[PDB]
Amino acid sequence: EPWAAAVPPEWVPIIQQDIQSQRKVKPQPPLSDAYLSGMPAKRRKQLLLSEAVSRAAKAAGARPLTSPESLSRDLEAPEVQESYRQQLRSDIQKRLQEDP
Amino acid sequence: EPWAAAVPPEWVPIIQQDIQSQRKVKPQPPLSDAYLSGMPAKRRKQLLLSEAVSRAAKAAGARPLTSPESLSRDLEAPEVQESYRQQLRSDIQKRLQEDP
Amino acid sequence: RNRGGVQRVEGKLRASVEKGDYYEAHQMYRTLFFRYMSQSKHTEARELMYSGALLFFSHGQQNSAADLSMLVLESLEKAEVEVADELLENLAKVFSLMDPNSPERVTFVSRALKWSSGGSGKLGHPRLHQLLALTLWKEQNYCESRYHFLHSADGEGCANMLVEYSTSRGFRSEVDMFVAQAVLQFLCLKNKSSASVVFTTYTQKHPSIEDGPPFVEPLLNFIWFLLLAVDGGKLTVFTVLCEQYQPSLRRDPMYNEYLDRIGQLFFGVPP
Amino acid sequence: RNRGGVQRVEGKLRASVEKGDYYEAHQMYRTLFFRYMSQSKHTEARELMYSGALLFFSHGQQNSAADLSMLVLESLEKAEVEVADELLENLAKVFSLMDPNSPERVTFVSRALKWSSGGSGKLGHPRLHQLLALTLWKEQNYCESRYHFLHSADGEGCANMLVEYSTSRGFRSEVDMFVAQAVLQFLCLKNKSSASVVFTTYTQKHPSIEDGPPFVEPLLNFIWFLLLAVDGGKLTVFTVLCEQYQPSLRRDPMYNEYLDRIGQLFFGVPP
Amino acid sequence: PQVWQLISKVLARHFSAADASRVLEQLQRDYERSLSRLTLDDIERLAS
Amino acid sequence: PQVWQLISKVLARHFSAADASRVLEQLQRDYERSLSRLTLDDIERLAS
Amino acid sequence: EPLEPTLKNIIEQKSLKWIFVGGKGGVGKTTCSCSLAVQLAAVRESVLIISTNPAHNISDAFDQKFSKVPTKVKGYDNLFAMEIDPSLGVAELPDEFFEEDNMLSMGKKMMQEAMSAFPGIDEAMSYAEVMRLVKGMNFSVVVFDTAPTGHTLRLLNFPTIVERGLGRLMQIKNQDQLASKLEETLPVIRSVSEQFKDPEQTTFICVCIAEFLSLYETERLIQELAKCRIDTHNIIVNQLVFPDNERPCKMCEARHKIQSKYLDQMEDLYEDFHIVKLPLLPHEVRGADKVNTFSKQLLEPYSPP
Amino acid sequence: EPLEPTLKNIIEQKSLKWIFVGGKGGVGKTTCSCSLAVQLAAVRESVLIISTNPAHNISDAFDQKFSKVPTKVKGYDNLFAMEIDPSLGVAELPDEFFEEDNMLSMGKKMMQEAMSAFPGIDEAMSYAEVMRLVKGMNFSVVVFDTAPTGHTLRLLNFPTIVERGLGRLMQIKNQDQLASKLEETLPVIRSVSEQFKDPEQTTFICVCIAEFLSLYETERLIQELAKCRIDTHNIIVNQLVFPDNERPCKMCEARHKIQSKYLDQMEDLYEDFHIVKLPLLPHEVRGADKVNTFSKQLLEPYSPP
Numbered sequence A, B: 001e002p003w004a005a006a007v008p009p010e011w012v013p014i015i016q017q018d019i020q021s022q023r024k025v026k027p028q029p030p031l032s033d034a035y036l037s038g039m040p041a042k043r044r045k046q047l048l049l050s051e052a053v054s055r056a057a058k059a060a061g062a063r064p065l066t067s068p069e070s071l072s073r074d075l076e077a078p079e080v081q082e083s084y085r086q087q088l089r090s091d092i093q094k095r096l097q098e099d100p
Numbered sequence C, D: 001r002n003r004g005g006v007q008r009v010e011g012k013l014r015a016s017v018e019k020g021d022y023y024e025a026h027q028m029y030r031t032l033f034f035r036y037m038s039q040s041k042h043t044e045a046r047e048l049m050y051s052g053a054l055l056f057f058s059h060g061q062q063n064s065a066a067d068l069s070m071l072v073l074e075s076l077e078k079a080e081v082e083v084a085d086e087l088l089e090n091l092a093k094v095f096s097l098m099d100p101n102s103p104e105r106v107t108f109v110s111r112a113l114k115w116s117s118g119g120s121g122k123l124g125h126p127r128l129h130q131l132l133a134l135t136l137w138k139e140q141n142y143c144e145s146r147y148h149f150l151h152s153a154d155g156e157g158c159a160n161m162l163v164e165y166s167t168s169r170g171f172r173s174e175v176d177m178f179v180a181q182a183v184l185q186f187l188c189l190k191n192k193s194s195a196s197v198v199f200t201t202y203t204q205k206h207p208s209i210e211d212g213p214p215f216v217e218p219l220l221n222f223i224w225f226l227l228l229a230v231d232g233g234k235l236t237v238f239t240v241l242c243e244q245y246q247p248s249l250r251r252d253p254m255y256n257e258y259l260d261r262i263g264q265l266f267f268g269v270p271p
Numbered sequence E, F: 001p002q003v004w005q006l007i008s009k010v011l012a013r014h015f016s017a018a019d020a021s022r023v024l025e026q027l028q029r030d031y032e033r034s035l036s037r038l039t040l041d042d043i044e045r046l047a048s
Numbered sequence G, H: 001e002p003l004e005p006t007l008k009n010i011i012e013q014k015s016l017k018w019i020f021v022g023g024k025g026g027v028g029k030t031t032c033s034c035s036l037a038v039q040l041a042a043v044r045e046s047v048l049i050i051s052t053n054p055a056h057n058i059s060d061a062f063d064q065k066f067s068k069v070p071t072k073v074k075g076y077d078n079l080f081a082m083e084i085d086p087s088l089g090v091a092e093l094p095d096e097f098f099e100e101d102n103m104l105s106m107g108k109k110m111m112q113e114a115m116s117a118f119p120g121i122d123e124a125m126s127y128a129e130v131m132r133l134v135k136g137m138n139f140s141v142v143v144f145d146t147a148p149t150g151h152t153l154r155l156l157n158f159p160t161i162v163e164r165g166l167g168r169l170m171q172i173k174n175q176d177q178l179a180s181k182l183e184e185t186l187p188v189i190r191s192v193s194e195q196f197k198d199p200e201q202t203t204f205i206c207v208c209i210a211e212f213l214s215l216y217e218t219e220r221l222i223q224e225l226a227k228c229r230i231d232t233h234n235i236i237v238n239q240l241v242f243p244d245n246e247r248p249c250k251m252c253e254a255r256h257k258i259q260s261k262y263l264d265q266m267e268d269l270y271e272d273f274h275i276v277k278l279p280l281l282p283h284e285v286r287g288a289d290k291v292n293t294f295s296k297q298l299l300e301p302y303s304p305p
Ligand SMILES: Nc1ncnc2c1ncn2[C@@H]1O[C@H](COP(=O)(O)OP(=O)(O)OP(=O)(O)O)[C@@H](O)[C@H]1O
Pocket: G024, G025, G026, G027, G028, G029, G030, G031, G032, G053, G055, G057, G147, G148, G238, G239, G278, G279, G280, G281, G282, G283, G284, G285, H024, H025, H026, H148, H211, H212, H213, H214
């Protein structure tokens, strides 16, 4: 290849492999905050449903027909929504499993 | 005259006199500071020769051939210049005489 | 019992005044004023403060008396007491009793004027302005006396003060110009009747001015015609008078802008 | 006689320390420091302050010891003492003895670094940076330890600390990226030899990295080739390496700007 | 039973069909993004 | 004897003819203006 | 009939959060404030003491140096102390990876240099710490060892003027990303102002000695506080002298006469105020033990044996 | 061997113009400053005393209220007193002849309203009065009854920072008629700074009591003054207690023990300082007569009978 001319010949082989490997490696997963601490960027890596639904509506600009206050009242976090809260706990446990 | 039409007829005579007198009255002399105190303007109404001569040169932009410091030294306020200082005193006395 | 402290404080204040401990009496006056105000006894507090200020003035305690007078003004302000002639006379007496050169007077008057009808024009009752002007004239503070007279509503005493000021200080040729200035300033203050009375009195009483509406001085005739036109309100007459007398009006340039207000004020001249 | 006061003060300080009146001893330490400085006895003042700070640290007087350490730094600054390894070790010991979370350390180090060759780059002797980094690593303050190592000149201990930090905190897939970040930052600091040694040591010693310059990880091979190119200084090689490895360099976007500096720094790339 | 059933049945009474569907899918997208980018700090925050 | 003689003879040694004449006439103009506009306050200032 | 001459109300008023100790200089603001904080620490879950006075003495009062960040006071478990720092936030160590933005560098340099020595910086920094606390709520109550009457009054006025200025600004907001920061500050600003103006949330302890200067400085301070509408319903008379009739001396007798005169004046003047009287002690009131002993009588009405 | 324990040097140093009295609060700054001014009035042609402390007490000290403009002190012919005014220059009565310029009206309104209550206004106004004096030179010498150590140090630093800022501005002058005003101020600014930094022109009197807090506050004040390079070569130990061996009492004995300890510490610490010792008096030090009597011993080394 053209670029191979500039680099020394013995660098030429490995690079191709690195290129070939590079085309199949799955993109970088979200980084560890420990690593990010070494960079000045302020990037980083909604448990409660009322605010999650409000954010979804805001990002979609959906107009609640009755009211958003009713939406908040419709639950008040009862046992059938505690179902969802421990569903969240389980989901983040599975996340941790995939990142041990 | 044209302006006489607007004003009442009996005002007409006197005004002419005031006009005629007005053309001969010598302009206003400098006002008394007492009078000027009644107006917000900061107008108002060089005893020593060194600074007077410096001001004259500045207003004329004259370049002293030898030096201005020499000009100041040339007098140092001796008796022959005390002549000028009491000449000043006499001149302001005459001023006061004309304004008693 | 709870109130007993105030009575004991008042008795101690009386005793201290008797002993001549004037500064301690001043401090206890302040304390009593604050205690009374906390009880909403505005009238009693003001009367006590006035009596204390008068007493301190009588004994030469200038600074203490000024502080107590300022407390009196504070009492007037906080209680929103409606302006009354007696209170204005009281404040005028206090102002007179002060040291003329002391800055407190400046602080006092500015406040006092700001109190009396403080919502519009620093006017209050022009009675207060008249009293201050009379006090200054007796003190021979001609500048401030004239200023207050101009802001006052009394023209007769104003004219007499102007005559005295011109004779004592005014030059030979400024006699007419003084009254012209005062009259134009009155008109700038929108007080036509004051201007009329002051001009009439000044012309009648001034020794160097010959009696008769047909005055020799062109400026006096111009002022008379200007007053008559303002009574009429005809803009054309005002313009004619201004134009024909321009040589006299140029005697002091500022007259011109005064006229600019006058035409705007009494003849509908747009700004 | 005039000097007798200082000796009596020193004796009283010794007595107070014996009695355990630690705060009074701290105050008298301050007084003695100022008296000595007024006499230009900079060395004696600094030694006394260091001894007092060590003693206060031994007894748990954290705030007093920090204040005395700051006075030591003031003595170093005012006397313009040339940086020496012993003084740097002394300051490092003082910093270690401090409470890790106390703000004084931040104030101390910033000052201490600002003292040692305060005219350029906060460098001083990178020996000081190495000592601070080692102390933090022993404290397991990995972030600040890494920062100082990057500003230090020791790569071997730096590499060991990076290995420990990655194993303890780094994810499974970030192992190569940690060393890549450190190496690129070293190059951004213009320290090529530090980058070479740290990369070599990290690759050799890390359990999850297979020995051999032909590393399986594309990023490690890219870093090795980049180091070799920087040794060569050929811009075309740098551009080729950056282009061919773009998928790996995109793993953390910021790498790119690091390269922008590297090309500017080691390959004459205009800014 | 699971999150989506709960939210769909709750929002079927207060949003329009299009609005409810958009809200639900936006919530699912946000949840997927949060799960993807979850880190330890998120785990401690949840534990608290 | 009078001001003008003094100043002219003093300035005849240090200014050019044109410069000396201009300085002298400017001084005379300033003196005339000061005399014209003199008031009492000037009299007290001089007395001090 | 009169209010109990003790700070018992302060202890019993549990809602009380911000406590200010002030008065004429040298009367004992530091010692009395430390005593009050110690007494509170036996009731509240956690109490802080802040030496807003630039001439910090709490370190000397408790015989234990304190940093600019709260630190537990030796001998206590829930009592903390701090001294306000006039200097602005320290400069973080630059990364240096990229050439620093000179504009921000010099802006922060001037911020940390010029206003650090400005005359009004001390009170402003105290106010900033108050804002930090209103954001934190870490401590149950906080006791301020304020500077003398003048600067303490300046500090107490500062929230009002700053809130008024921010309100004006928000009126002028319509006529460049700082708007969000202003809107973030303004809630904290009204919060601090409201808490200071609420008697149930705060109170000012005026500490004074039985003397003309101290007495009338305290009177002026009380009137100024009333103007600021800060509740103040107790005074601490300090350094009183109680002669011993067994072996009296001229100095103590005359001092007692003067103090009795001015204390009668105080009691007459300050009805509806808990006037707690603190005797002069023959030993330095420094250290946890001595301070606690002094506070014990600060709460129990002292009476000479 | 030691320096004479009197302010005799202050009196004899005739070139001295600006005298600062400061220290811990309540030590006697006001009384000692008034005494020093009274002593000076018997030597200098005319002496002024300025109560820069917002909690002005010179009125109480001399038992005669003083305005914000110098006023002759009762009982003296060349002694004047004043209290600094935090408020800015009053608004002159508008003529009203013409509609007022709203821009200037509101500018002056804000000038007189906002910064009037700003925390740093007091020291700034004191500095402004210092500038006025450096423009006037009406009084031979001026004695400042400064606030406690912190704010006094702030005031003493203010000239340096303001002069530095004006120098920076003049450097930036090249990059709208205010330039002349800045150039008019700058001479006065270097004049005040130079006078403050000149020992022959000024000196700081540190007044303290024989106690730990006062002692070490005074030490910190002295060190800060040395940092500001303001000459200070005398201390005023005040409120000392001298027991009477004839009929001693426990309180006086213990207080004397404490004061003797801390005074020995002072003498050891403050070599090359005229340490003048002022006993506690059994009568209020107020009024011209009492103040003069107190000053008499302020100059003659007090020794118990
Ligand atoms: N009741 C008391 N008995 C004995 N000594 C006391 C008493 N109260 C205060 N002191 C001592 O008097 C001196 C002045 O008290 P303190 O320093 O607490 O005053 P302050 O109001 O905090 O002063 P500043 O305004 O200067 O901060 C200190 O030595 C203090 O120890």
